[PDB]
Coordinates of all heavy atoms in Angstrom, one line a residue:
Chain L
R270 N 21.5 31.2 37.3 CA 22.6 30.4 36.9 C 22.5 28.9 37.4 O 22.3 28.7 38.6 CB 23.9 30.9 37.5 CG 25.2 30.1 37.1 CD 26.4 30.7 37.7 NE 27.5 29.9 37.2 CZ 28.7 29.9 37.9 NH1 28.9 30.5 39.0 NH2 29.7 29.2 37.3
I271 N 22.7 28.0 36.5 CA 22.7 26.6 36.8 C 24.1 26.0 36.7 O 24.7 26.1 35.6 CB 21.7 25.8 35.9 CG1 20.3 26.4 36.1 CG2 21.7 24.3 36.1 CD1 19.2 26.0 35.1
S272 N 24.6 25.5 37.7 CA 26.0 25.0 37.7 C 26.2 24.0 38.8 O 25.5 23.8 39.7 CB 27.0 26.2 38.0 OG 26.8 26.7 39.3
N273 N 27.4 23.2 38.7 CA 27.8 22.2 39.6 C 26.7 21.2 39.9 O 26.3 21.0 41.1 CB 28.3 22.9 40.9 CG 29.5 23.8 40.6 OD1 30.4 23.4 39.9 ND2 29.5 24.9 41.2
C274 N 26.1 20.6 38.9 CA 25.0 19.7 39.0 C 24.8 18.8 37.8 O 25.5 18.9 36.8 CB 23.7 20.5 39.3 SG 23.3 21.7 38.0
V275 N 23.9 17.8 38.0 CA 23.5 16.8 36.9 C 22.2 17.3 36.3 O 21.2 17.4 37.0 CB 23.4 15.4 37.5 CG1 22.9 14.5 36.4 CG2 24.7 15.0 38.1
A276 N 22.2 17.5 35.0 CA 21.0 18.1 34.4 C 20.3 17.0 33.6 O 20.7 16.6 32.5 CB 21.4 19.2 33.5
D277 N 19.2 16.6 34.1 CA 18.4 15.6 33.4 C 17.3 16.3 32.6 O 16.3 16.8 33.1 CB 17.7 14.6 34.4 CG 17.0 13.5 33.7 OD1 16.7 13.6 32.5 OD2 16.7 12.5 34.3
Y278 N 17.5 16.3 31.3 CA 16.6 17.0 30.4 C 15.5 16.2 29.8 O 14.7 16.6 29.1 CB 17.4 17.7 29.3 CG 18.4 18.7 29.7 CD1 19.7 18.4 29.9 CD2 17.9 20.0 30.0 CE1 20.6 19.4 30.3 CE2 18.8 21.0 30.4 CZ 20.1 20.6 30.6 OH 21.0 21.6 31.0
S279 N 15.5 14.9 30.3 CA 14.5 14.0 29.8 C 13.2 14.4 30.5 O 12.1 14.2 29.9 CB 14.8 12.6 30.1 OG 15.9 12.2 29.3
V280 N 13.3 14.9 31.7 CA 12.1 15.3 32.4 C 11.4 16.4 31.8 O 10.2 16.4 31.5 CB 12.5 15.7 33.9 CG1 11.3 16.3 34.6 CG2 13.1 14.5 34.6
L281 N 12.2 17.4 31.4 CA 11.6 18.6 30.8 C 11.1 18.3 29.4 O 10.0 18.8 29.0 CB 12.6 19.7 30.7 CG 13.1 20.4 32.0 CD1 14.3 21.3 31.7 CD2 11.9 21.2 32.6
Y282 N 11.8 17.5 28.6 CA 11.4 17.1 27.3 C 10.2 16.2 27.2 O 9.3 16.4 26.4 CB 12.6 16.5 26.5 CG 12.2 16.2 25.1 CD1 12.0 17.2 24.2 CD2 12.1 14.9 24.7 CE1 11.7 17.0 22.9 CE2 11.8 14.6 23.4 CZ 11.6 15.6 22.5 OH 11.3 15.4 21.2
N283 N 10.1 15.2 28.1 CA 9.0 14.2 28.1 C 7.8 14.8 28.7 O 6.7 14.3 28.4 CB 9.5 12.9 28.8 CG 10.5 12.2 28.0 OD1 10.5 12.3 26.7 ND2 11.3 11.4 28.6
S284 N 7.9 15.7 29.6 CA 6.7 16.3 30.2 C 5.8 16.9 29.2 O 6.1 17.6 28.3 CB 7.2 17.5 31.2 OG 6.1 18.3 31.5
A285 N 4.5 16.6 29.4 CA 3.4 17.0 28.5 C 2.8 18.4 28.8 O 2.0 18.9 28.1 CB 2.3 16.0 28.5
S286 N 3.3 18.9 29.9 CA 2.8 20.2 30.4 C 3.2 21.4 29.5 O 2.6 22.5 29.7 CB 3.3 20.5 31.8 OG 4.6 20.7 31.9
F287 N 4.2 21.2 28.7 CA 4.7 22.4 27.9 C 3.9 22.5 26.6 O 3.6 21.6 25.9 CB 6.2 22.2 27.6 CG 7.0 22.2 28.8 CD1 7.8 21.1 29.2 CD2 7.0 23.3 29.7 CE1 8.5 21.1 30.4 CE2 7.7 23.3 30.8 CZ 8.5 22.2 31.2
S288 N 3.7 23.8 26.2 CA 3.0 24.1 25.0 C 4.0 24.0 23.9 O 3.6 23.6 22.7 CB 2.4 25.5 25.0 OG 1.4 25.6 26.0
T289 N 5.2 24.4 24.2 CA 6.3 24.3 23.2 C 7.6 24.0 23.8 O 7.9 24.4 25.0 CB 6.4 25.6 22.4 OG1 7.3 25.4 21.3 CG2 6.8 26.7 23.2
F290 N 8.5 23.3 23.1 CA 9.8 23.0 23.5 C 10.7 23.1 22.2 O 10.9 22.0 21.6 CB 9.9 21.6 24.1 CG 11.2 21.3 24.9 CD1 11.1 21.0 26.2 CD2 12.4 21.3 24.3 CE1 12.2 20.7 27.0 CE2 13.5 21.0 25.1 CZ 13.4 20.7 26.4
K291 N 11.1 24.3 21.8 CA 11.8 24.4 20.6 C 13.2 24.7 20.8 O 13.6 25.7 21.4 CB 11.1 25.5 19.7 CG 11.9 25.8 18.4 CD 11.9 24.7 17.4 CE 12.6 25.1 16.1 NZ 12.7 24.0 15.1

Side-chain angles (χ1 to χ4, degrees):
Chain L
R270 182 183 183 202
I271 300 169
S272 67
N273 298 318
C274 61
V275 179
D277 184 344
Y278 293 99
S279 294
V280 172
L281 292 171
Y282 183 69
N283 289 334
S284 167
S286 69
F287 296 119
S288 295
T289 188
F290 195 120
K291 173 67 178 177

